[PDB]
Amino acid sequence: NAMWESKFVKEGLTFDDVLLVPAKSDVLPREVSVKTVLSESLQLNIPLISAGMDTVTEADMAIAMARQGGLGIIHKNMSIEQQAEQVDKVKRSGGLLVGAAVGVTADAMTRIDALVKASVDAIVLDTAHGHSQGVIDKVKEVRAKYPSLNIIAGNVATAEATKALIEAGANVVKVGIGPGSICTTRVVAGVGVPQLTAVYDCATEARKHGIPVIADGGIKYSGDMVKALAAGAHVVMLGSMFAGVAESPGETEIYQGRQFKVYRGMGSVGAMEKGSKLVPEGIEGRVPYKGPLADTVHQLVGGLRAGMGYCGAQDLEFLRENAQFIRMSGAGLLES
Amino acid sequence: NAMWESKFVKEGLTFDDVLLVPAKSDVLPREVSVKTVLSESLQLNIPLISAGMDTVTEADMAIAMARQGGLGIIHKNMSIEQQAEQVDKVKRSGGLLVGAAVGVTADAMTRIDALVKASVDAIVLDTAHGHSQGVIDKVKEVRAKYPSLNIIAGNVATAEATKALIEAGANVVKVGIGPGSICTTRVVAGVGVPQLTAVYDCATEARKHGIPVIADGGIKYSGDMVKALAAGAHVVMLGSMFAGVAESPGETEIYQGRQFKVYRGMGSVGAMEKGSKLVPEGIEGRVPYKGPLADTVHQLVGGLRAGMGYCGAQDLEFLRENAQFIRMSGAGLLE
Amino acid sequence: NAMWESKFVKEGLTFDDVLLVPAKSDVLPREVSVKTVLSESLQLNIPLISAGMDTVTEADMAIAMARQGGLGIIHKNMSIEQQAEQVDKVKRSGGLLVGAAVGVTADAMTRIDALVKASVDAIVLDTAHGHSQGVIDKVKEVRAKYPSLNIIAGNVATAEATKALIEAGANVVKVGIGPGSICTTRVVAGVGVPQLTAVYDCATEARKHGIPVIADGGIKYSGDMVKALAAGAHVVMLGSMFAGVAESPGETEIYQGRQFKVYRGMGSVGAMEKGSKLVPEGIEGRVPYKGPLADTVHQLVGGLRAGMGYCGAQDLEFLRENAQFIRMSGAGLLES
Amino acid sequence: NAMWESKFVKEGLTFDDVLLVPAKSDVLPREVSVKTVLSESLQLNIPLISAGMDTVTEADMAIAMARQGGLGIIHKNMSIEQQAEQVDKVKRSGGLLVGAAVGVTADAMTRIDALVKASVDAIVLDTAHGHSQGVIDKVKEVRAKYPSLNIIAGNVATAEATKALIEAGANVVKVGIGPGSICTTRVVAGVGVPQLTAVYDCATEARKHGIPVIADGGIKYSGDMVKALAAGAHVVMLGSMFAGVAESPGETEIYQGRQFKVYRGMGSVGAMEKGSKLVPEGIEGRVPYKGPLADTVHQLVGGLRAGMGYCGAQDLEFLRENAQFIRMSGAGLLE
Ligand SMILES: C[C@H](Oc1cccc2ccccc12)C(=O)Nc1ccc2oc(-c3ccncc3)nc2c1
Ligand SMILES: C[C@H](Oc1cccc2ccccc12)C(=O)Nc1ccc2oc(-c3ccncc3)nc2c1
Ligand SMILES: C[C@H](Oc1cccc2ccccc12)C(=O)Nc1ccc2oc(-c3ccncc3)nc2c1
Ligand SMILES: C[C@H](Oc1cccc2ccccc12)C(=O)Nc1ccc2oc(-c3ccncc3)nc2c1
Ligand SMILES: O=c1[nH]cnc2c1ncn2[C@@H]1O[C@H](COP(=O)(O)O)[C@@H](O)[C@H]1O
Ligand SMILES: O=c1[nH]cnc2c1ncn2[C@@H]1O[C@H](COP(=O)(O)O)[C@@H](O)[C@H]1O
Numbered sequence A, C: 001n002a003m004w005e006s007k008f009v010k011e012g013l014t015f016d017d018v019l020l021v022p023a024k025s026d027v028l029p030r031e032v033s034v035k036t037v038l039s040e041s042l043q044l045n046i047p048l049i050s051a052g053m054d055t056v057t058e059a060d061m062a063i064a065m066a067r068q069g070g071l072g073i074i075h076k077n078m079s080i081e082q083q084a085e086q087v088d089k090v091k092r093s094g095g096l097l098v099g100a101a102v103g104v105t106a107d108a109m110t111r112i113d114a115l116v117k118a119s120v121d122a123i124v125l126d127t128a129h130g131h132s133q134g135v136i137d138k139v140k141e142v143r144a145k146y147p148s149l150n151i152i153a154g155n156v157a158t159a160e161a162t163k164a165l166i167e168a169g170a171n172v173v174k175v176g177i178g179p180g181s182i183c184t185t186r187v188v189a190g191v192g193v194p195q196l197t198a199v200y201d202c203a204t205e206a207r208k209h210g211i212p213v214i215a216d217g218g219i220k221y222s223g224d225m226v227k228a229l230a231a232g233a234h235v236v237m238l239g240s241m242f243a244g245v246a247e248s249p250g251e252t253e254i255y256q257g258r259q260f261k262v263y264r265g266m267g268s269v270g271a272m273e274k275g276s277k278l279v280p281e282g283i284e285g286r287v288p289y290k291g292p293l294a295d296t297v298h299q300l301v302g303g304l305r306a307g308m309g310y311c312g313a314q315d316l317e318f319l320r321e322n323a324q325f326i327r328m329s330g331a332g333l334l335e336s
Numbered sequence B, D: 001n002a003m004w005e006s007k008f009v010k011e012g013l014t015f016d017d018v019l020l021v022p023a024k025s026d027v028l029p030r031e032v033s034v035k036t037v038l039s040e041s042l043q044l045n046i047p048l049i050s051a052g053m054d055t056v057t058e059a060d061m062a063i064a065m066a067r068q069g070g071l072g073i074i075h076k077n078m079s080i081e082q083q084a085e086q087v088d089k090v091k092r093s094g095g096l097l098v099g100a101a102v103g104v105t106a107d108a109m110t111r112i113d114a115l116v117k118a119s120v121d122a123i124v125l126d127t128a129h130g131h132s133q134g135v136i137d138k139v140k141e142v143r144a145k146y147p148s149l150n151i152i153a154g155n156v157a158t159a160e161a162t163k164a165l166i167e168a169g170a171n172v173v174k175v176g177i178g179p180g181s182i183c184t185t186r187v188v189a190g191v192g193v194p195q196l197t198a199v200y201d202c203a204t205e206a207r208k209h210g211i212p213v214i215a216d217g218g219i220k221y222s223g224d225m226v227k228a229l230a231a232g233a234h235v236v237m238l239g240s241m242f243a244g245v246a247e248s249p250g251e252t253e254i255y256q257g258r259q260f261k262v263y264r265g266m267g268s269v270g271a272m273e274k275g276s277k278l279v280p281e282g283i284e285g286r287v288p289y290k291g292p293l294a295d296t297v298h299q300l301v302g303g304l305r306a307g308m309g310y311c312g313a314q315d316l317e318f319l320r321e322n323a324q325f326i327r328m329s330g331a332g333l334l335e
C-alpha cells in the first residue's frame, strides 16, 4: 500500500506564495520580445488567450484579441451553425487567428467538421476533467481524421495527464483544475492543484516532447501572468480579466450608476442550462465594465515587459527556462 | 525525558490544508457507487450519518436519513422510555436503519436493553473523551452481553485510542476531538487534533483490524466530506449541515423575516442543563432554515460524486485506498 | 563568524500554533490535582498568579487571589511605606500568601528590607530585560542578605538567561519578553520570543536545577494556560484576564451604559510617570468589567481540569512531563 | 536544466516573519552608540536616510536630517540648476552632510558635475533595477572621473548584483526590490525579494569587501528598522515614515479637519509625469501630517536604543555581527 503512505506527501504553490527574483539585465522593457510559437501554424504576438466562456468570447472578442496579437476561443454554448458562422466572421475580418471550443460528446465530430470547413485555426477539447478516457478517445479520433489541425486539450493538472494527452495526439495542453475566480470545484468536490505547481509539473513533462502548455485560470493581476509564464507556460488564458470589457458578449447593466457586466462559470446553474443533473461547480457574478479590450491588454503586456526587464529575459523562452522564484510566507503578501 | 523531547514533533492537517489531486478516470459522477458497509448487518447506501444531538436527530430526522440511504442517531437527552419509542417509531416505518446514543453511566446498561428490545441497529457509546477507562470498560461489558450488536465508540483522535476501543469490542470507531463548528474545546481546554490528521491516524490503525471509522465534525462543505472519506473514513457524521433542515427537532424561529433554527453543542450550557459542574465546551447559535433534508443530501452526494469523478474512484474503497492529496499554504486557500 | 550563519536558524511557536493531544485517561476533571510547589515555603493550591501591575494587583486583589489558592504580586508604583502596608494588609487577613515587585534600582535594598519586615512571602525582581548585569548583581545582593527569602527574577526568554538567574540565586524564573496583550516591545524594538518556545526552552534548563518557571504574558483564554503549563511552566501569571475584575484597583467607568476598567502596560506613558526618557513599550486601554474574581478563576481552573482530563494528567507534574502537542497551520485556527 | 530544477528552491523572510532574541546585556538604551560610518568621508550620528522622492526630501528635509545626525537625498524630479542650489543651500547651513539622486541617462554626467561643483557629499545612482548593464556602466564612468566621490548605487536584492555594483566602483550599495509601502512592483511585474532576506544576502556579499549596505523600503515601525540593521544593513532609508513631517516638500492638505500630506511612489503616474511609456509601479496616497521631523526621529532612535538594549549591542557593529533572530508563523504575528 504505497498509495496509503504517500497520501499527504505532495506540496503545492499558488501565485501568492512566490515572487520572481531579479537577475542581470541588458534589455529594457520596451525592447523585449513577447511572441510565442504554440505550433508551426499558430504563432501569437502576445502570450494571451481569452477564455471560451459565454460571458467572455464571441466573434467581437476574438477579433479584438487577434488584432492585439493574441487569440480568442469561441464558446460552445451555441448551435453548430452559430459557431461555424462565428468562426467565419473572424476569418473574414482580415486573416485573423481564431480557436473554438468543443465538448467531448457524440456530436463532437459533427461540430468539429463544421468548424474545420469554416477554417478554424485550433479546436479546444476541454472538459472539467481532461484525464479521462472520454477525452483521450476523442482526441485520438479527431487526430486520426485531421492530422494537421491544432488540438488543444485539457484541463489537466498532472504530469501523468499531460503525458496521456500528448500521446493521444494533442499538440497543446491546457492546465488548470480549480484555480478559476468563478470556480467552486475546491469547495464542492475538494479537488484541485495550486496553479503554479500544476503549470510547472505539466510543463516539466511537456518539454520532454516539445509540447507547449497553457496556464488557464486564477490570473488576477499582470504579475500573476509573469509568474505563470516563468513557471513554464507558453501562454495564459484569462476569464475574469476579460469579462468586463466592451468586446465581451453580454449586456452592460447599470446598478447604482455603475456599469457592470455579468461573468459566470460554465459550470454555473445558468450556463449549464444554456448548454442544453451534475452539481454546479461555478458561480455567477458581476464584474466592473473595463472599457475597450485594448486598455486591459496594454496594461497586462506592460506588466509582463517590466517583469522581463527585471529578469533580464529578452524573450519568453528565457523566462520559462531561467527565471527563478523565491518563496515567501503569508506575511510576505502584506509587504507587497 | 523522551516525552519531554517529543513534545512538539507532531504536525497535523485540517480540511483547508489540502486538496485532492485529479487522476485517471473512466467513471462518470452518475456512475460511481457511494454505498458503504460498516458491518455485515449495517449497510448504508450513502456514507452519511446525522449527529445524535438534541437539535439534530430525532425520529423524523432518522426516518428521512434512512430513506436517503444513510442513518440517524437518536440523541440521549431524553428518558429511556422516550428513546425506545423513538427508535421503535423509525423501525415501524418499514425496516429502516436507526441508531441510538447512550452515555457512559451506571444507567447505560438499562437504557441499552430498552434500545435492543426496541430493535436498534447500532448504539453509539460516545463521550467527549473516548480514550478513557470508563468508556473502555463500558464497551467491554456491552459486547459481553450482546455479541452481535453494532457498537460505535468515540470520540477518539489517535491510533492508540483507536486500538484500545477495538480491543474492548467496538466494531466501529468515531473520530473527532475538537473539529466541530459549535465546539469550544480547543479554546477552553487547549485540546484537539486537526481532523484530517486524526481520521488518517485512526484509519491507519483500524484498517489493520478491518474496522471502519466515522469522521465526526468540522465538515462545512461537501468538499470537506470528500476529503474525510479520502483520508480513510468509511462515512461522515454531520451536525451543523443538518441542523437547519425541516426534519430536525426544534421550532423554526423567525427573525426579521428570516427563518432560523437553533443549533447548540451537547456540551453547551443549555444542552447540559436538559441532559440532567463541568465548564461548557460548546456554544449555542442559530443556523438558517434550509427546507427539506432531501435537498441538502442531494447537494452533498452530488459534490461527492464529482469528487470521485475527478479521482477515478468507481467506489468508496478506491477513494480511501488510492486518492492522493496535495498540501498548500494559507495563501493557497484564497484561490 | 558562526553568529552570522546562525542568524535565521531558530524557530518559535506561540499558543495559537499548537494543540494538546488527548491520551489515555483514568481521571475525571473533578478529581485531578491542580496544586503546585514553587518552593518549600511557597505552595499554591491553584497555578495562577496575578500580575504586579498598577491596574491589576493591590491588597484587595492579592487577598482574593490567595483565598482562591493562588498568589498576587503587589505592584511597585507606590512608595515603600505604601507597599509595606499593602503587604501587611494581606498578611493580617488570615495567613494568606503574598508577593511584592521591586525594581533594580539603588533603593531596591531599602524597599526589600521593609517588605521583609512586613513578612512578604516572595519578592519579584523583574525588569523588562532580565538577562542584564544589573539584575544579576541585584539578585546576588538580595540572596546574600536574605538566604531564605523566595526570589522570583525575570523577565527572560532563553535557556542562557535562565541559567544566569539561577546561578545568581533566584529560586523561581519568570518567562516572557513580548507576549503581553498590552505589550508593544515587538513593534517598537523588534524584540521577542514566541511564548511557548520561551517557556519550553527556559524550563528545559530550569529542570536541570529543579527550579520552576512562571509563564508570564499572552494568556488570552483558559486553553492557553493549559498549553503554557504543558510546555513546562509550574504556574502562569495573568494581566488582562484579571484587570476587568472587581478586586483589581482602579475606577469602574461607564461609557455607553457599559462598565469598563482601565488596563495599561507598566511601560505605557501613564504608568512610567507614576513610577516617578525611554520610549514607551506598552499601551493603555479599557477592558470589560468581569465582576468578582471568583468567577474568572472558576472558569480558568475549570478549563485546566478539562484539559487535564483529556491528557489523563492526575497532577500538574504529569502534564509538564508527558503532555504532547501537535502543530497546526493558521488554517487550523479556523477549525476551532 | 539545472535552472529549471532550482526554480522554487529559494525561501525569503520579511520583517513580520521574525523577532530579535534578547541576549546578555550590560549597556542601557541611553548608553548605546548609534553612530555609523559609511565611508571615511561620510559618517552619520544616526543610521537614518530620507528617501530621494519628490514628496519626501528637498533642502528643508535634508537640513533637518543632517541636524539630527542623519542624511537627506535631494530628489531628481527637478532641473540640474534647481538640484545644485538645493544642495548648496544645505551646505550653506554650516557644513551639513547632503546627498543627491541622479538618474541613469546621458544627462547624468552633466548633472553630477553640477552636484560635485555644489559640494554634494554623496550621489545616489538608483533605478528600479540596479542589476543592469546601464547602471554598471554609469557607475564605472562616474568612478573613473571622480575617484573620491561617494557613490551609492541600487536598487539590488541579490549577492550577485551586490558584487557587480561593488566591482564597478560603488562604495555603498542600496538594497530593496519590492518592499516599499507605495510599491506595486510585485503586483504589476510579479518581481521582488522579501526585505530581510535581501538585506542579509547582499550584506553577506558586501562584507567580504568591507562595503556597507542601505536597507531601503518597507519599514513601517521602529522595530522593523532594528530588524534591518540586525540583518546586516549599516543604515536604513525611509520614505513613508518621513512623508508626513513638516519639513517634507508638499502642501499640508486639510480634509474633514484632518491634516494630510500626499505621498507617492516615484514610479507613480504623477511622479513619472513630473519627471519628464512604462506601466506605473507605484501608487499615490495621503499620509497623516506628523508635525516636526524631530519628534519622528526621536521615537525611531528610541525604539532602536531599546532594541540594542535587549540585544546587548553597545554599538551597531555588534548588532550586525551578533544579533540573532527567531522565526515565527503568521499566527505568531498576532501576539
Ligand atoms: C458541472 C461541472 O462543471 C464544470 C466544472 C469545472 C470546470 C468546468 C468548465 C466548463 C464547464 C463546466 C465545468 C462538471 O463538469 N463537473 C464534473 C466533475 C467531475 C467529472 O468527471 C468527469 C468525467 C470523468 C471521467 N470521464 C469523463 C468525464 N466529468 C466531470 C464533470
Ligand atoms: C462539558 C464537555 O462536553 C463535551 C465536550 C466535547 C465534546 C462533547 C460531545 C458531546 C457532548 C458533550 C461534549 C465535556 O464533556 N468535557 C469533558 C472534558 C474532559 C473529560 O474527561 C473525561 C473523562 C476522563 C477520564 N475518564 C472519564 C471521563 N470526561 C470529560 C468531559
Ligand atoms: C520603557 C520599557 O518598559 C517596559 C518594557 C517591557 C516590559 C515592561 C514591564 C514593566 C515595566 C516596563 C516595561 C522598558 O523598560 N524598556 C527597556 C528596553 C531595553 C532595556 O534594556 C535594559 C537594560 C539592559 C542592560 N542592563 C540593564 C537594563 N533595560 C531596558 C528597558
Ligand atoms: C516605472 C517603474 O518605476 C519604478 C519601479 C520600481 C522602483 C522605482 C523607484 C524609483 C523610481 C521608479 C521606480 C520602473 O522604472 N520600472 C522598470 C521595470 C523594469 C526595468 O528594467 C529596466 C532596465 C533593464 C535593463 N537595463 C536598463 C533598465 N528598467 C526598468 C524599469
Ligand atoms: O464553472 C466553472 N467551474 C470551474 N472552472 C471554470 C468554470 N467555468 C470556466 N472555468 C475555468 O476557469 C477559467 C477562467 O478563470 P479566470 O481567468 O480566473 O476567471 C476558464 O478558462 C476555465 O478553465
Ligand atoms: O458541545 C460540544 N463540544 C464539542 N463537540 C461537540 C459538542 N457537541 C457536539 N459535538 C461534536 O460535534 C459534532 C458535530 O459537528 P459539526 O458537524 O461540525 O457541527 C457532533 O457529532 C459531536 O461529535
Ligand SMILES: O=c1[nH]cnc2c1ncn2[C@@H]1O[C@H](COP(=O)(O)O)[C@@H](O)[C@H]1O
Pocket (backbone or CB within 6 Å): C051, C052, C053, C155, C176, C178, C179, C180, C181, C182, C183, C184, C185, C216, C217, C218, C219, C237, C238, C239, C240, C241, C264, C265, C266, C267, C268, C281, C282, C283
Ligand atoms: O508595558 C509593558 N510592556 C511590555 N510588557 C508589559 C508591560 N507591562 C506589563 N507587561 C508584561 O505583560 C504581562 C501581562 O500580560 P497579559 O496577561 O497578557 O496582559 C505582565 O505580567 C508583564 O510581564
Ligand SMILES: O=c1[nH]cnc2c1ncn2[C@@H]1O[C@H](COP(=O)(O)O)[C@@H](O)[C@H]1O
Pocket (backbone or CB within 6 Å): D051, D052, D053, D155, D176, D178, D179, D180, D181, D182, D183, D184, D185, D216, D217, D218, D219, D237, D238, D239, D240, D241, D264, D265, D266, D267, D268, D281, D282, D283
Ligand atoms: O513607485 C515606486 N515603486 C516601487 N518602489 C518605489 C517607488 N517609489 C519609491 N520606491 C522605493 O521605496 C522606498 C521608500 O519606501 P517606504 O519607506 O516603504 O515607503 C524608496 O526609497 C524607493 O527605494
